[PDB]
mmCIF file of C-alpha atoms in Angstrom:
data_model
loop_
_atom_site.group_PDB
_atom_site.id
_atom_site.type_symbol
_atom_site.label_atom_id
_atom_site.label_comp_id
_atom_site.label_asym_id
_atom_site.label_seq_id
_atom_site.Cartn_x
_atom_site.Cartn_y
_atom_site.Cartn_z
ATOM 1 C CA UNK A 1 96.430 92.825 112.023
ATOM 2 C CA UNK A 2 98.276 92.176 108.720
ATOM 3 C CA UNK A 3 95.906 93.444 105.712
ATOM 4 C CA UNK A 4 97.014 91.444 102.244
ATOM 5 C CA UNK A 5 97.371 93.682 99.220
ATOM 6 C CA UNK A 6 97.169 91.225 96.746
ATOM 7 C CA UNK A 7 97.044 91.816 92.410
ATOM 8 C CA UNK A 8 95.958 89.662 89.585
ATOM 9 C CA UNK A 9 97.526 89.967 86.372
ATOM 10 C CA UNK A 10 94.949 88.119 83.871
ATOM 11 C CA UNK A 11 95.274 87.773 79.772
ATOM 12 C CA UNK A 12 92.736 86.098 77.739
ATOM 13 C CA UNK A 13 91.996 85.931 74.151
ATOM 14 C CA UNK A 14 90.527 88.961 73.098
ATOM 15 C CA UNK A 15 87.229 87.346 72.176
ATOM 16 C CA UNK A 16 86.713 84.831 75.571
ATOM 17 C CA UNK A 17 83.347 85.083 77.184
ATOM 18 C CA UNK A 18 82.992 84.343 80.867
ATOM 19 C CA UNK A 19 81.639 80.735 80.745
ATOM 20 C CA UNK A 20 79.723 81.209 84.476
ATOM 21 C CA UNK A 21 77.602 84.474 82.569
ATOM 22 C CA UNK A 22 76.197 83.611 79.383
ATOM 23 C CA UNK A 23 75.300 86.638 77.361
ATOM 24 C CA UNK A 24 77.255 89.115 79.897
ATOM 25 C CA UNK A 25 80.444 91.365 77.679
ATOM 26 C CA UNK A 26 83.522 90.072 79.456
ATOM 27 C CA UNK A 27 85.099 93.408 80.292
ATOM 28 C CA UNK A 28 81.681 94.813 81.833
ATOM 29 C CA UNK A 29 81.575 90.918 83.928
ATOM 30 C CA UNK A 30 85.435 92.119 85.290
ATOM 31 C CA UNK A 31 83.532 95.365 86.396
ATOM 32 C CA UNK A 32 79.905 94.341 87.317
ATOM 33 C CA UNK A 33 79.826 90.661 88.659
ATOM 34 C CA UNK A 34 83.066 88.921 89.623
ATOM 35 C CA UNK A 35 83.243 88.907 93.139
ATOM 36 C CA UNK A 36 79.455 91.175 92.845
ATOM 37 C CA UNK A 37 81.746 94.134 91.136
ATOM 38 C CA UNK A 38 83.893 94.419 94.378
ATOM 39 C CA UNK A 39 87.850 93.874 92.844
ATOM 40 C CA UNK A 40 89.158 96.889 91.143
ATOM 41 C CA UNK A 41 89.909 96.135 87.423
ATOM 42 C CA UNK A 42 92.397 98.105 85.179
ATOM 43 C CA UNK A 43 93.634 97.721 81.685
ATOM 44 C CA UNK A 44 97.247 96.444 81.726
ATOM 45 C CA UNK A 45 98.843 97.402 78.564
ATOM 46 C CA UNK A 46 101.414 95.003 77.232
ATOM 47 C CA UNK A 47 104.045 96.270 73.985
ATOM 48 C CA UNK A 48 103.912 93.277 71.121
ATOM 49 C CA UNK A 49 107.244 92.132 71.874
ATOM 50 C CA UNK A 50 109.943 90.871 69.137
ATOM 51 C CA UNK A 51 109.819 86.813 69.398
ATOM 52 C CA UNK A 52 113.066 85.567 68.059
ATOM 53 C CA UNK A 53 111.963 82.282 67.339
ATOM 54 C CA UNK A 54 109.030 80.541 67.759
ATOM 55 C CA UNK A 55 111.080 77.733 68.759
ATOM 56 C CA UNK A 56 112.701 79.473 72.113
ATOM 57 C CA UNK A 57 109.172 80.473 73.613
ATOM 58 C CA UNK A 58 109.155 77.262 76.193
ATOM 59 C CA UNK A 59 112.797 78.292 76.915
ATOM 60 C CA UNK A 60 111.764 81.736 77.630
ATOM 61 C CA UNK A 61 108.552 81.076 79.318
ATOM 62 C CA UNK A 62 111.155 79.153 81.678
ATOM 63 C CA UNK A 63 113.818 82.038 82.307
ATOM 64 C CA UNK A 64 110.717 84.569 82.916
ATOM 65 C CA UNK A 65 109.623 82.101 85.715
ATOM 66 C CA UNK A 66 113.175 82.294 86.920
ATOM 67 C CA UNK A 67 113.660 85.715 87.151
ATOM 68 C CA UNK A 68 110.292 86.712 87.987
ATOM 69 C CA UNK A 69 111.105 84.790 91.317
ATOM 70 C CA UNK A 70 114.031 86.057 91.695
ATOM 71 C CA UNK A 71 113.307 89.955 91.289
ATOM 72 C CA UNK A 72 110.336 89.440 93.741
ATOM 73 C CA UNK A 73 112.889 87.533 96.118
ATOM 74 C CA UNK A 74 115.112 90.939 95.765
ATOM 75 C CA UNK A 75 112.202 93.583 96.199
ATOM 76 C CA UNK A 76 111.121 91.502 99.105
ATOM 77 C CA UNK A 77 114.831 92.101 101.091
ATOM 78 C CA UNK A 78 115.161 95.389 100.187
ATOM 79 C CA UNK A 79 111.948 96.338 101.780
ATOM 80 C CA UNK A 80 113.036 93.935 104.979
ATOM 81 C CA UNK A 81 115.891 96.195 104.794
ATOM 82 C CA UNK A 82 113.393 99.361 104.752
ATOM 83 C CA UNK A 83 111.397 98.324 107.451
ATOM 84 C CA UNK A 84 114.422 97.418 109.762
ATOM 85 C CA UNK A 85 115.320 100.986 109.289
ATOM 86 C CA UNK A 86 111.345 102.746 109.757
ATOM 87 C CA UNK A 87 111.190 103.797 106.420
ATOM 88 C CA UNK A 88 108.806 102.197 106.029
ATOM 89 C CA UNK A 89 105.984 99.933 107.713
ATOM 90 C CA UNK A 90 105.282 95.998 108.078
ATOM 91 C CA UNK A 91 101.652 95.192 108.929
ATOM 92 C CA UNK A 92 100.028 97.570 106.477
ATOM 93 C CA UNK A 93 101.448 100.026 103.413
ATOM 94 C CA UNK A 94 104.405 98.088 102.885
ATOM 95 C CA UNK A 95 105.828 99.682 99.868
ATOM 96 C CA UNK A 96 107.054 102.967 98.584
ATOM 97 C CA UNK A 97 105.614 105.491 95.541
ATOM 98 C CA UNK A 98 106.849 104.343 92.306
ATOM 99 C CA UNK A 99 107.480 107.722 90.284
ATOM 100 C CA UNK A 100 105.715 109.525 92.796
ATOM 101 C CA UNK A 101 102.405 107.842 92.569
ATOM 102 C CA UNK A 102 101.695 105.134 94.986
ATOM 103 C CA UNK A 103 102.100 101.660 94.117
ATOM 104 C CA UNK A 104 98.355 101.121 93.123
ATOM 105 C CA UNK A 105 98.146 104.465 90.796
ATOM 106 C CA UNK A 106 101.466 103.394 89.060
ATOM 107 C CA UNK A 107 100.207 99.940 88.692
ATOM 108 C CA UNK A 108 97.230 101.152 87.214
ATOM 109 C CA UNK A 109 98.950 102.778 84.491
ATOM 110 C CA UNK A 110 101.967 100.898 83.427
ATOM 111 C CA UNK A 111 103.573 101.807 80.472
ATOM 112 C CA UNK A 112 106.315 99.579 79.286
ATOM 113 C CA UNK A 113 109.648 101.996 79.124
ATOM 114 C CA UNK A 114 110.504 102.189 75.507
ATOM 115 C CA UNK A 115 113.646 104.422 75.547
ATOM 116 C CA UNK A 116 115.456 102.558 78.212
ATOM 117 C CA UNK A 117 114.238 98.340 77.170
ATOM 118 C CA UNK A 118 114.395 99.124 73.691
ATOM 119 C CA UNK A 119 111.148 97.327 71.815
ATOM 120 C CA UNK A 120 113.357 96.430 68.791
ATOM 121 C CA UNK A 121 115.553 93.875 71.140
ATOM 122 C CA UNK A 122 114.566 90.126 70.756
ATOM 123 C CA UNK A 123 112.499 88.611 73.980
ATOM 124 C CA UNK A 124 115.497 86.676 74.765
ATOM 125 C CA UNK A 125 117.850 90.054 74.896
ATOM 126 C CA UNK A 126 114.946 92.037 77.335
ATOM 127 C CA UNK A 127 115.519 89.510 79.694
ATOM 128 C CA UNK A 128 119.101 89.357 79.870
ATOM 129 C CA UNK A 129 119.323 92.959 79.804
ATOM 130 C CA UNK A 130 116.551 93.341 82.555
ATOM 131 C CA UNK A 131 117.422 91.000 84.896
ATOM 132 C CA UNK A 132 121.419 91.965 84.658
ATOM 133 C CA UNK A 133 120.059 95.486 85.589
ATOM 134 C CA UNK A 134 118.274 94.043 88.344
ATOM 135 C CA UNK A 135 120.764 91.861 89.909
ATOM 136 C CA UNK A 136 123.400 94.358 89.755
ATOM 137 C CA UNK A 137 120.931 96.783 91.987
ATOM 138 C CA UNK A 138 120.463 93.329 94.280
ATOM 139 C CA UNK A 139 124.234 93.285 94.882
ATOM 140 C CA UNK A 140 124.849 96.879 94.983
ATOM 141 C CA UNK A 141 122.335 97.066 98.231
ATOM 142 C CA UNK A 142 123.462 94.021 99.777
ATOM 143 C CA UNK A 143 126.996 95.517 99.940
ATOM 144 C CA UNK A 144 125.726 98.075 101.499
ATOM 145 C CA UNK A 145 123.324 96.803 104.058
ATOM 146 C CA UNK A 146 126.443 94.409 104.746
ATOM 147 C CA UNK A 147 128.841 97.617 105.149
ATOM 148 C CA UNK A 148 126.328 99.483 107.356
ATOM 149 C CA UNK A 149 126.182 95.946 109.445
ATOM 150 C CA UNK A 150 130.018 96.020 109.987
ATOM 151 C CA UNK A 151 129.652 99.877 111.255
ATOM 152 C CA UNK A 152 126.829 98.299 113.627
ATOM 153 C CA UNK A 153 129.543 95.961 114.637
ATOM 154 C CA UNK A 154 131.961 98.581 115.764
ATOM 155 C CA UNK A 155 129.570 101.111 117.064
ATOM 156 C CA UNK A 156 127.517 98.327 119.059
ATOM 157 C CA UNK A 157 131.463 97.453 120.675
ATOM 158 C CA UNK A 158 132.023 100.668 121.925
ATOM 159 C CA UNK A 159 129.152 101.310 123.022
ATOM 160 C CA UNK A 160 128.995 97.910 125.400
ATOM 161 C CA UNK A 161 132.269 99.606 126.786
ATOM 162 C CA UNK A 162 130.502 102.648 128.208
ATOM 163 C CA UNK A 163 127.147 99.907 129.842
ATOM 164 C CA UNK A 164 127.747 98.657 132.913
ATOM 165 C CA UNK A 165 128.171 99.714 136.556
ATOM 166 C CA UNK A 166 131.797 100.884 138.326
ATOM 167 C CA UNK A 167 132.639 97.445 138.508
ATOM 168 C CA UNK A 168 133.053 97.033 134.976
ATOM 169 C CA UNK A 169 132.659 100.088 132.983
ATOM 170 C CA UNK A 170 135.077 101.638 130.868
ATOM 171 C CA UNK A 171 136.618 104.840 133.208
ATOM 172 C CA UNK A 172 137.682 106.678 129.571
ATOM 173 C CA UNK A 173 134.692 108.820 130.264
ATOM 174 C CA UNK A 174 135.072 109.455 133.834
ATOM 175 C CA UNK A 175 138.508 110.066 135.204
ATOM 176 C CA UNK A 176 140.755 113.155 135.374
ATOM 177 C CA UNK A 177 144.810 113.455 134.916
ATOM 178 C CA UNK A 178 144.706 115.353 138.625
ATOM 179 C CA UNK A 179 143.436 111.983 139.704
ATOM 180 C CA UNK A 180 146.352 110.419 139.110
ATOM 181 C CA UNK A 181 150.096 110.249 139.908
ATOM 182 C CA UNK A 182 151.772 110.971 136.595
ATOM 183 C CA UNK A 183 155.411 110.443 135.542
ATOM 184 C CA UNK A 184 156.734 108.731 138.572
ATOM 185 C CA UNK A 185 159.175 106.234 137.854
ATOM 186 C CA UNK A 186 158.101 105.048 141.294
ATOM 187 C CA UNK A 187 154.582 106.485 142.938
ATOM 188 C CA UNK A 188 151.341 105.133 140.896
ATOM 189 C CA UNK A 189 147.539 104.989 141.556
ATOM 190 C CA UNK A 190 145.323 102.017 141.780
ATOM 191 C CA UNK A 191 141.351 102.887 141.320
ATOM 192 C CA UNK A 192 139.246 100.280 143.368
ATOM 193 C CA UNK A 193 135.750 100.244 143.015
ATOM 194 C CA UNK A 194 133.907 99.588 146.520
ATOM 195 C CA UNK A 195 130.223 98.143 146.884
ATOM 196 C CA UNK A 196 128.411 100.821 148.885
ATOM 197 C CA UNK A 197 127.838 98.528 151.722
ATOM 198 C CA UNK A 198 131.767 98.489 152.273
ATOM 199 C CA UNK A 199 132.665 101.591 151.804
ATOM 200 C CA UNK A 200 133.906 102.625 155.829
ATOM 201 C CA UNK A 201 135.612 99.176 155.721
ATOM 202 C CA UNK A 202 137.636 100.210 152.781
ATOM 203 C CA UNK A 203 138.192 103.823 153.824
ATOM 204 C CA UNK A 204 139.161 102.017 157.325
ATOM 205 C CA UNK A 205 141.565 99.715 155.682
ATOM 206 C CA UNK A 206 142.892 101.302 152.238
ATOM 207 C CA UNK A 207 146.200 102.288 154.277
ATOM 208 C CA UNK A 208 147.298 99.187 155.406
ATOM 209 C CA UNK A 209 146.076 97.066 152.185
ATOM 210 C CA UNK A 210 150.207 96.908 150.977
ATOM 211 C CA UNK A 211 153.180 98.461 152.519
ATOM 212 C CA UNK A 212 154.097 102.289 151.662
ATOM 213 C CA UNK A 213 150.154 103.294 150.250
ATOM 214 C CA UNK A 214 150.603 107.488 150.554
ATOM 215 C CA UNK A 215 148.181 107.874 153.782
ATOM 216 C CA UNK A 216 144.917 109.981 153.059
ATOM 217 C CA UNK A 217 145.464 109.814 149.595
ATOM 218 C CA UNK A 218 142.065 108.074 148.611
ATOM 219 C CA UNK A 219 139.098 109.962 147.303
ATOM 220 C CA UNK A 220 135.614 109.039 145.832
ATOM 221 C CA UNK A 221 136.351 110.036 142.368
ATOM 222 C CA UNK A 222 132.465 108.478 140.882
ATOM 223 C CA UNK A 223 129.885 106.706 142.424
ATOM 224 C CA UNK A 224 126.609 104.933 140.658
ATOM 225 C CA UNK A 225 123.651 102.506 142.242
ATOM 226 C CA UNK A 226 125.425 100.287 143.619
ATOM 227 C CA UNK A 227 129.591 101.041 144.126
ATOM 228 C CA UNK A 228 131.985 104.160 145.159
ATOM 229 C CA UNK A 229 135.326 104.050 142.710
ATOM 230 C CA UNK A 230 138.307 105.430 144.868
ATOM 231 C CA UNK A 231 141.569 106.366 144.148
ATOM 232 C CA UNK A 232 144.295 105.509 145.958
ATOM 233 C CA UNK A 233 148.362 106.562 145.569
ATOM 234 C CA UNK A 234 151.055 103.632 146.537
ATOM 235 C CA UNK A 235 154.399 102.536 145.752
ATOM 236 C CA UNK A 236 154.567 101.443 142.051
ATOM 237 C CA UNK A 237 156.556 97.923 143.679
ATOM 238 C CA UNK A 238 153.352 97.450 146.195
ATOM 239 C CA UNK A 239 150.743 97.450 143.579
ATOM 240 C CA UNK A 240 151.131 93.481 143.438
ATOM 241 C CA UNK A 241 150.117 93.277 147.147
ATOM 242 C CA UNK A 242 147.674 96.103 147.343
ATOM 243 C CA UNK A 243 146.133 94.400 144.405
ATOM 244 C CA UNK A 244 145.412 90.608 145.810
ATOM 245 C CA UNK A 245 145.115 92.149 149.663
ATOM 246 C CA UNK A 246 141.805 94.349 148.053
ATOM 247 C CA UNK A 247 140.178 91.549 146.065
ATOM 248 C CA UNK A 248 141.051 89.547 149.404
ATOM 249 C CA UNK A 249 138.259 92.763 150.773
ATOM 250 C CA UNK A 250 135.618 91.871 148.210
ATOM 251 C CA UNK A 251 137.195 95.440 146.598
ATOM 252 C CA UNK A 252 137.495 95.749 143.054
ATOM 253 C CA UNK A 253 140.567 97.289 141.549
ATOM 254 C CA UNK A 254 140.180 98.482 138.173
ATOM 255 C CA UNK A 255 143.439 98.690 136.200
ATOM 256 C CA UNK A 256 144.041 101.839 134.343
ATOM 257 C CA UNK A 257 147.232 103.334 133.220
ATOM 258 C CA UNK A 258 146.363 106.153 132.612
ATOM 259 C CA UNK A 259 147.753 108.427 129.590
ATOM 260 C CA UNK A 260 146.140 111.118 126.659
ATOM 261 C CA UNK A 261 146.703 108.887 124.066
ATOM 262 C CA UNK A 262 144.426 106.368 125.435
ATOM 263 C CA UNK A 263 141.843 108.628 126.798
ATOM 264 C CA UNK A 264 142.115 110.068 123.364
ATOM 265 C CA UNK A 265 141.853 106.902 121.250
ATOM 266 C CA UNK A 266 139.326 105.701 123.486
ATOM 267 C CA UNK A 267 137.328 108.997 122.503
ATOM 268 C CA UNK A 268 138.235 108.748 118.785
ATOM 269 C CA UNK A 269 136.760 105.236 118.806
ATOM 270 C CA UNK A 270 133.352 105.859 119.865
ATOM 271 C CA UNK A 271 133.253 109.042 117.957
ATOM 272 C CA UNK A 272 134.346 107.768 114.361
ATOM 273 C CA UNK A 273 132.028 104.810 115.637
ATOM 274 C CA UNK A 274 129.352 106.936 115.786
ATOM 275 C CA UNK A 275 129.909 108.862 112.732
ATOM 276 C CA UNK A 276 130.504 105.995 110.615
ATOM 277 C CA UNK A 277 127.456 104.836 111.328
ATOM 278 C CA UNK A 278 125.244 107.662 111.234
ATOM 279 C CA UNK A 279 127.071 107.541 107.308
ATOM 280 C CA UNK A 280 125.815 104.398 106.392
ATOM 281 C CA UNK A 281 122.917 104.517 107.616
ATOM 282 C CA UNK A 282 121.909 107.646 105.450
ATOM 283 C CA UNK A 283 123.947 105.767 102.699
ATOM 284 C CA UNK A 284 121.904 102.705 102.629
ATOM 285 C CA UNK A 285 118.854 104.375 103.317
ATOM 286 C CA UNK A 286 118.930 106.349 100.199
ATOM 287 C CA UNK A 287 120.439 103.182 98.208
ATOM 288 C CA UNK A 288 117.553 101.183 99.325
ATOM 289 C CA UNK A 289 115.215 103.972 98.551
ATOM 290 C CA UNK A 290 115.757 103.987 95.170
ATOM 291 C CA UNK A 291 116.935 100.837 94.517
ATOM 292 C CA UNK A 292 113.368 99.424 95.207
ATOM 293 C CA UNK A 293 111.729 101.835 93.002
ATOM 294 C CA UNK A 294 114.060 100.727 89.712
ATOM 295 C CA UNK A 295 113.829 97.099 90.936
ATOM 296 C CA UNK A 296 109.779 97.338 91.013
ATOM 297 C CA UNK A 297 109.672 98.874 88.018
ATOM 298 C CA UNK A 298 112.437 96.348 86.340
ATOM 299 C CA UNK A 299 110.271 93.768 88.139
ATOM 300 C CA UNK A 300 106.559 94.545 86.132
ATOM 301 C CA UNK A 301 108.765 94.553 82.914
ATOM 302 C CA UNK A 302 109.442 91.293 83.437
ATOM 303 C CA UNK A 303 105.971 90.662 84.324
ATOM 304 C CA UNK A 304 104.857 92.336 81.175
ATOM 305 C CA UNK A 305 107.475 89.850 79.161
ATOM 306 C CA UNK A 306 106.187 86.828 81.140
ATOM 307 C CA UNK A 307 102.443 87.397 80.485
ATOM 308 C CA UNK A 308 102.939 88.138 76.958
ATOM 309 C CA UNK A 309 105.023 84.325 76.461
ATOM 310 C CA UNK A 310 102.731 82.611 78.326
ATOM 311 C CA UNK A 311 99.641 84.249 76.557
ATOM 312 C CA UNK A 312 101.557 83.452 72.938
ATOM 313 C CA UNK A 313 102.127 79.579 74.339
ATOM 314 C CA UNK A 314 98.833 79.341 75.766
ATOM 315 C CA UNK A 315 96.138 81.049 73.179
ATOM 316 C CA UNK A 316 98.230 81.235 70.336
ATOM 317 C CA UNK A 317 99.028 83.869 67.022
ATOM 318 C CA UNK A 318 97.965 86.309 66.407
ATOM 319 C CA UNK A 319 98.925 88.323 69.799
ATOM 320 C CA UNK A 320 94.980 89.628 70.561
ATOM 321 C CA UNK A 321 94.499 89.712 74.106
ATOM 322 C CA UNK A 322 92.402 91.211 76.625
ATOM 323 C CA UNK A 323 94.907 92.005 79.617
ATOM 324 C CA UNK A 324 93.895 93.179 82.975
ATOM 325 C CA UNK A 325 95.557 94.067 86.156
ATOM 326 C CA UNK A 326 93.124 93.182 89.481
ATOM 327 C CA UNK A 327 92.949 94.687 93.063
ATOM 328 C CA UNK A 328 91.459 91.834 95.084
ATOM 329 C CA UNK A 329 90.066 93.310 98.261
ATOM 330 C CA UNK A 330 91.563 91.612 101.259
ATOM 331 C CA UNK A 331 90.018 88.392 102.310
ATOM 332 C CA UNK A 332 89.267 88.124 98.863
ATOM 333 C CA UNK A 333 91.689 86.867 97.225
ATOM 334 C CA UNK A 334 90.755 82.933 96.990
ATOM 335 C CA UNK A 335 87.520 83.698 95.939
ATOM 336 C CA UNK A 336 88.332 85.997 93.113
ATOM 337 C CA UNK A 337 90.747 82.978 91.806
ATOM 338 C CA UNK A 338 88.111 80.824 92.050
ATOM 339 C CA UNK A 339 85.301 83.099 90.362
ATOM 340 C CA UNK A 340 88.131 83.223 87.102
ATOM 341 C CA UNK A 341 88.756 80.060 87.470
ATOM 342 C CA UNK A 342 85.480 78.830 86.971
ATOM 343 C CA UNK A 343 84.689 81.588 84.141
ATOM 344 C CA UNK A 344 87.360 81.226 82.218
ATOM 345 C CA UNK A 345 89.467 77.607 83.140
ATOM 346 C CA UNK A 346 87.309 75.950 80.009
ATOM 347 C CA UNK A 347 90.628 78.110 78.213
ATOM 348 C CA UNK A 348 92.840 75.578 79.507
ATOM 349 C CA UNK A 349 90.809 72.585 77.744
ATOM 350 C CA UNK A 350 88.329 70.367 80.375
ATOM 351 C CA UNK A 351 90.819 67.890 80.405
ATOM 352 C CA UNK A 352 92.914 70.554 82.742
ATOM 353 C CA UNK A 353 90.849 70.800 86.404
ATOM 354 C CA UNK A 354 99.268 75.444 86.882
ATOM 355 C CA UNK A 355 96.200 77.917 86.199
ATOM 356 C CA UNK A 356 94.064 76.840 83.337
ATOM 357 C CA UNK A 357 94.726 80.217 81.822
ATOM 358 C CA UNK A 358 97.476 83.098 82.228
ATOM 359 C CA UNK A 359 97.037 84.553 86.103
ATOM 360 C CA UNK A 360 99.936 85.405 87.977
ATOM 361 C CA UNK A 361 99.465 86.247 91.891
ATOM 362 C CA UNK A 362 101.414 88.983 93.020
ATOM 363 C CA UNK A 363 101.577 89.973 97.053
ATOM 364 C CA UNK A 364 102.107 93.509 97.830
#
């Protein structure tokens, strides 16, 4: 069960009446009768922004649209991102707090940050300065998300090493130097591993698979579900023969040359694997973390901007508006549109049945 937590933000002029209740005062109607008083209805207080130029308003208007998209876009991977990692869920409470208040509580008391978007900078400079701030924390977490994904990479490769039965498996893990004939520039050891089923055949046979094997040298040095790896000791120049005669057996020899260094590195891989990782991971975590609150916030700012422009555009100058922010319940959330619609879309002219008036939709 997904539950939608879906928002309104709504401007009007100041002095618009609900056309749908005659008589009834238009912030009381928000309260009292839309959907029969059920949506939650808060001020949303907007700054009077600096307009450059009456002139650039359709231009802006057109850049907020932009970046309004994109932001949401943004806030929507990170939280992907989030949820990929369980910090946080899908079908329900899909966000984070937002200055320690959940998303509804800061939401219902926005307050446009005057000492860090400075209210003497032009509409046009806001924006630029916004959504640069915004985009930069967009790349920042995809480079790390991508990072962590590379130390997946790695960590996912040596871990595959370690999967599999005697047959395949890595032996890094599993084998001893005393199982092995070390430093011979002649004597060696092959390790075969043998299906259960055949292991008296191979302990009946294992002497006479090349010339010069060392007789009883072969022990069961592991055994899983299904096979018994041996060790045998042979004649470095009858490894070729030993070799084809086993696989001849249904035998599997497994080469290994065995030395520290590889043993070692083969450690050190998995290991650094591991911790790189686990480093990442707390990295990007954290990143994302706060990344999505600044980008939320960042992201209301430009709603703020983007209601304001349309609500110039739209219902003129002076800038007197009545602004509201709306909790639709779920299930909701086409009726409340159409409720405003039809108590307020005469704003739009009757020409106009795009919302006839200034209502953005935002999913949470």
């Amino acid at each position: 069960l997904y539950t939608a937590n879906d928002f309104i933000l709504i401007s009007l002029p100041q002095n618009a009446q609900p056309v749908t209740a005659p008589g009834s005062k238009t912030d009381s109607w928000f309260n009292e009768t839309l959907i029969g008083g059920r949506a939650f209805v808060s001020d949303f207080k907007i700054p009077e922004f600096k307009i450059g130029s009456l002139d650039t308003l359709i231009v802006e208007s057109e850049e907020l649209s932009k970046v309004d998209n994109q932001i949401g876009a943004s806030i929507g991977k990170i939280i992907e991102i989030l949820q990929g990692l369980n910090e946080t869920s899908t079908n329900a409470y899909r966000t984070l707090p937002i200055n320690n208040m959940p998303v509804p509580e800061y939401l219902e008391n926005f307050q446009w940050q005057t000492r860090k978007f400075k209210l003497d900078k032009s509409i046009k400079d806001l924006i630029t300065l916004i959504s640069n701030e915004s985009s930069q924390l967009d790349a920042d977490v995809r480079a790390t998300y991508a990072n962590y994904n590379s130390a997946k990479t790695n960590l996912a490769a040596a871990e595959r090493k370690k999967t599999g039965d005697l047959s395949v498996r890595s032996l890094h893990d599993i084998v001893k130097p005393e199982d092995f004939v070390l430093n011979s520039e002649h004597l060696t050891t092959v390790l075969v591993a043998v299906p259960k089923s055949l292991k008296s055949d191979f302990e009946k046979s294992y002497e006479t698979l090349s010339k010069n094997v060392v007789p009883a040298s072969a022990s069961v040095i592991a055994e899983d579900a299904e096979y018994v790896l041996f060790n045998v000791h042979l004649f470095k120049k009858n490894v070729q023969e030993f070799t084809t005669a086993a696989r001849e057996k249904k035998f599997i020899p497994r080469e290994f040359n065995y030395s520290e260094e590889l043993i070692d590195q083969l450690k050190k891989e998995h290991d650094s694997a591991a911790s790189l990782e686990q480093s990442l991971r707390v990295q990007l975590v954290r990143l994302a973390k706060t990344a999505y609150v600044d980008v939320f916030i960042n992201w209301f700012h430009i709603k703020a901007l983007r209601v304001y422009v349309e609500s110039v555009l739209r219902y003129g100058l002076p800038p007197h508006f009545n602004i509201k922010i709306i909790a639709v319940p779920p299930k909701n959330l086409s009726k409340c549109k159409s409720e405003l619609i039809d108590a307020f879309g005469f704003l739009g002219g009757n020409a106009f049945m795009y919302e006839p008036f200034v209502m953005y939709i935002i999913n949470l």
